[model samples]
Target: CGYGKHNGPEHWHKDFPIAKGERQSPVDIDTHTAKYDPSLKPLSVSYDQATSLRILNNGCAFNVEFDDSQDKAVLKGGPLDGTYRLIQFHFHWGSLDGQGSEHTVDKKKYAAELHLVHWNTKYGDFGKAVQQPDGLAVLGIFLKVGSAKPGLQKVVDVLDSIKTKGKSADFTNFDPRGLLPESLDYWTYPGSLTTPPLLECVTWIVLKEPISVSSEQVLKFRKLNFNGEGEPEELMVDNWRPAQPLKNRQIKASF
Candidate 1:
């Protein structure tokens, strides 16, 4: 149910059977055995900076919701068949610095991982898309330790507004694409959501390059509350789901 010692990933399979299903997410990205696919084109992300609605702490993580009313913000190309509208995004981190990322590359850990959730237009809505094979597409961006990240400051600035679960604040005129790295080169595969429900509908695009965020800014992430008022306060730390198995799967790289 929660990311606790007893109810963590190891115990999730009991309540959520799909947790043991194939095509799950947050896998160990091993480039040593990846297949290079030249047919894979660069990712195309079209976002309307004005469409950003607000940010909220949903107990699990802090999500920056966007108005996906129209095709205003969509992700095209990449390993996707058609256009998928960007709805929201969130992050997962560790209890300590330098080791929070859900998906690891070559066994290397990072500060955190950002997930940009998008739903296919053909699927009409995210709820419907999440039930189909080609339903969702998530861009996984890693955040590494560095000097204060100028780009991420926009996201970090709103943390104070949503210090507890169910808390939210308006946030507009923001482009999530700015949080991306220079290159769109990534490793793609079929996977499920890392958390509860664990729908096996997402096409994972794990970027090769990582974004930089200062260590101080990362500590602020640990301060967010996973529980609301009256409940036992649970600090938002090590919120990441464990990396799933890569059983009978092939990882495609677009370089």
Candidate 2:
């Protein structure tokens, strides 16, 4: 069963059996500052031959090879105390109006959101860390319809390569670090993975500012398919999870 008739948040919880006490993800954070932190130094991240890439029906997803070799931003304080490795980034959207995004802002919903999943290297493997709290760090970016924004053009350009269901494209020499916004302003809080297993102990960093995309770009995401056996023709619609409760969790904004 998919989204219900209303396509509202309440409908998602009723139809889907997400785990209780599971950390609900994609919390909307408002009122972030614009100050930058010197401790959060910029690290040079690159894609090399060691890097492994994977293409799927759920857009293009990849996993960077070297976890500790390259320089990356490290989490200073939190449940985790290791260098965060960028894993794979994916998207969530709706088929029609009234649905698509996991997070809501002032009761307003957007077309889509991008999740750049990362994990602490000390935990060893992403799969293993998924079950533990402080095992993952998800960078959430909200995408809205407007003038084209830089950094994401490359991702959208290759859409034609993976247009059909069950189709995949090899993407090499692609460094996802370039996709980050110039401003490092972000919001940090404790949450859980948005998908199944719904593991809590996740340190979430949601970008304070959102990126702009054309309406056509939004449509391209809606055309993607979910790569599941015997469901080859199953189109991906409303892959977003319903927003979870804050549970009085304190969210910090890095302005």
Candidate 3:
């Protein structure tokens, strides 16, 4: 029911029993044991800046949606069997400065985390597809506290407007590729969403390289309220779910 106490991720299994399932997400990654796949192909991303639609604060975190009508933006290769269309992108952070990333390296937490969601086109319903093993995919990127990322300013600029739950604004012409790092090397695995309705239907691709972000920008995201404008004020920080069990799953690396 909530992020802590009897209602937090620790208790999600009661309502969404799948939360206790083996394929849960945001698991800790051990890079030393990760097997590098020589056959892994480079990640190919084709994004149409115009397809960017708007941004929404859905009570958890802010997400920027895109028009996926005809594959205006698609993710190809890199541990994938078919093309997956980009639908939306969002982030997960903490109330404190450097302790909010969902996925961790050797159990080391980062400043924040970013996720780009995509769905397989073979299935008619994006929702249904995500329930299948290969129906959905998400790209996870870590954020390091350093120099402020210029491309990221576009997102931080609008935080004030969408600071409340159910709030949204016209956030258009954004090419997600611009926000990517020069290296696309990543680790692949099977897992579920870090949020509620934790369905075990995702193929996670986590980048090895982390991007830079200033502490000031993180403060803006922390300003968002979990409740709507008229409701009581609830800080929208610490929205990340704790890492889950690996359960014999392989963490494939592309290097």
Candidate 4:
């Protein structure tokens, strides 16, 4: 479903009844409420530059597709029991710089948010894994406006080419690792895909450290269009889903 008023997150549960499930995602992460879990281990992420295939605007948001045929790029450790292969990475942003992130911190919003999508290898392919409880693991990084991030610049430089929906361009030799922040400290919890399908399969690993992105870079992200070339103009901004409820869920912090 699209992120418009008529068919946004509010209307999702009507079509996909699972959207109202207990393990929904993008909850407001109150740091004070998160308990430090001594048992939680540091996250392990190994990625290859060759794994990056292309970048495209999927109407709702832009995504950097990856080659996940093998275990070239994977996420492990942390609260995970198995290796999760990287499939793609995407972003969610706002119409304005003040608010965009799906998961807020103590009701605080950021300029944008990044999601590194991965699937559990134990469950075979992504299609099958997405149906399991521990199927997917998303490494979520908050993007705050500050100095220009070189890593983010690489992706921003290519946005103009894929400005409209269904448009894409080759994005090779780009390492997703460059997008990571200095510290890997994170909060872990059982959650769902922030978008439609909204399947309750993802294990959300949201990093406490936020990466930098210049205001200009964020404007470049806003240039993306929800409609195609022939269709009416519609900016693909504020595509992020609001924070869902955290019912019977405990967030564990890895400090």
Whole-model lDDT per candidate: 0.88, 0.60, 0.87, 0.92
lDDT-wise, the better of 2 and 4 is: 4
**lDDT per residue (tens digit) for residues 1-255 in model 3:** 265455667878878888888899989999997899888887887775438899999988899999888878889899888889888999988888668899998898887999999999888668878779998889999988888988898999998999898999999887687678889889999998888888888999999899988989888888998889998898888888878999979998997
Clashing pairs in 1: 94-238
Please write out the lDDT profile of model 2 over residues 4-47, one tens digit for every residue.
Answer: 34653455454445544545776655443223444443332332
**Residue 94 CA error for candidate 3 (Å)?**
0.9
- Residue 1 lDDT, candidate 2, scale 0-100: 22
Best by lDDT: 4
The superposed Cα distance between candidate 2 and the true structure at residue 24, in angstroms, equals 1.8
lDDT of 4 by residue, 74-129 (tens): 99999999899999999999988889999999999998999999999998899999
Q: Each model's TM-score?
A: 0.97, 0.74, 0.96, 0.98
Better of 1 and 2 by lDDT: 1
CA-RMSD of model 2:
4.9
Error of 3 at 253 (Å): 0.8
Ranking by TM-score: 4, 1, 3, 2
In candidate 3, what residue range of length 10 has the lowest lDDT sum? Answer: 1-10
- Model 4 gets an lDDT of 0.92
TM-score of 3: 0.96
**Candidate 1: global Cα-lDDT?**
0.88
